[PDB]
Symmetry: none
Subunit: 80 residues, 6 copies
Amino acid sequence: QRVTISCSGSTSNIGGNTVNWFQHLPGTAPKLLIYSNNQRPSGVPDRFSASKSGTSASLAISGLQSEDEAHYYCAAWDDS
Amino acid sequence: QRVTISCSGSTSNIGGNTVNWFQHLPGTAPKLLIYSNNQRPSGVPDRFSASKSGTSASLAISGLQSEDEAHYYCAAWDDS
Amino acid sequence: QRVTISCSGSTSNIGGNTVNWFQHLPGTAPKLLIYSNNQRPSGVPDRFSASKSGTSASLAISGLQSEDEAHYYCAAWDDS
Amino acid sequence: QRVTISCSGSTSNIGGNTVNWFQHLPGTAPKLLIYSNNQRPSGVPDRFSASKSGTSASLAISGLQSEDEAHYYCAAWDDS
Amino acid sequence: QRVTISCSGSTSNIGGNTVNWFQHLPGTAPKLLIYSNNQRPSGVPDRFSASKSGTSASLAISGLQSEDEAHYYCAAWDDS
Amino acid sequence: QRVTISCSGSTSNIGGNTVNWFQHLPGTAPKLLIYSNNQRPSGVPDRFSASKSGTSASLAISGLQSEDEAHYYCAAWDDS
């Protein structure tokens, strides 16, 4: 036999960039405030898996590739 | 036999970029405030899985690829 | 036989860069404050796995590739 | 007799000011050029006077009180 | 007799100021050039006077009180 | 008799100031050049006077009280 199995992954290519951010900002006054008292997630897989709990109270400004990846690739189970 | 299995993944390519963000901002006054007291998610898979709990109280500004990916690819179960 | 198995991974290439960040900012006054009292996640896989708990109360500014990757690739189980 | 002679002068009062000029100018490219080959004035008073010759090839931006004053006040001649 | 003669002068009062000039100028490129070959004034008073010759090839930016004053006040001539 | 003669002068009062000039200037490139070959003024008063010759090839930026004053106050001539 000639069984062929080929999974894949997270191949990334950005290129160029020069994002320069935020420049030339005369006088501002950022006075943010964050205060949380909840958001308790959970997850209870039994047979299969790759649950992904996630909590945040951030400001969430993303420039390039701010992912929170979590991979689980090409699993198997026979129990012969 | 010649069984052929080929999964895929998260292949990304951005290219160029030069996003420059936010520039030339005369005097502002950001005074944001965040205060949460709830949003508790959950999830209880039993046989299959890859539940994905997610909570946020952010501001959520995205420039490029602000994903929150979670993969579970090509699972199997025989129990022979 | 000629069985061929080929998984993949996280191949990345950024290129160029020169992100320059944030420059030329006349007098500002950042006075942020963070105070949390909750967000306790969990996860209980039994047979399969690669759960990924994650908690944050940050500000979450990302310039390039701020991921939180977690991989689990090409697992197997026979129990012969 | 009670002859009373009262001339006047250049009394000035500006007040306040805070002219701030020209601010917050992202990248420009001033490439001015001046080249003159003439403008020769003259003046030949004989009996009375206070002629005022003036020549310029400037750019002439004025913010406040850019005068070129020249005074000659309360003259007399008797030749008794 | 009670002859009363009262001339005046150049009384000035600015007040306040805080002119701040020109601030927050990202990258420019001033490449001015001045080259003159003329502008020869003159003046020939005979009996009276206070002629005022003046020549310039400047750029002439004035912020406050850039005068070029020249005074000649309360002259007399009797030749008794 | 009670003859009263009262001339005046150049009384000045600025007040406050804090002119701050020109600040926060990212990379520039001043390459000015001045080259003159003329502007020869003159003046020939005979009986009265206070002529004022003046020549310049400057750039002429003035912040506060850049005058070029020249006074001649309360002259007399009797020749008794």
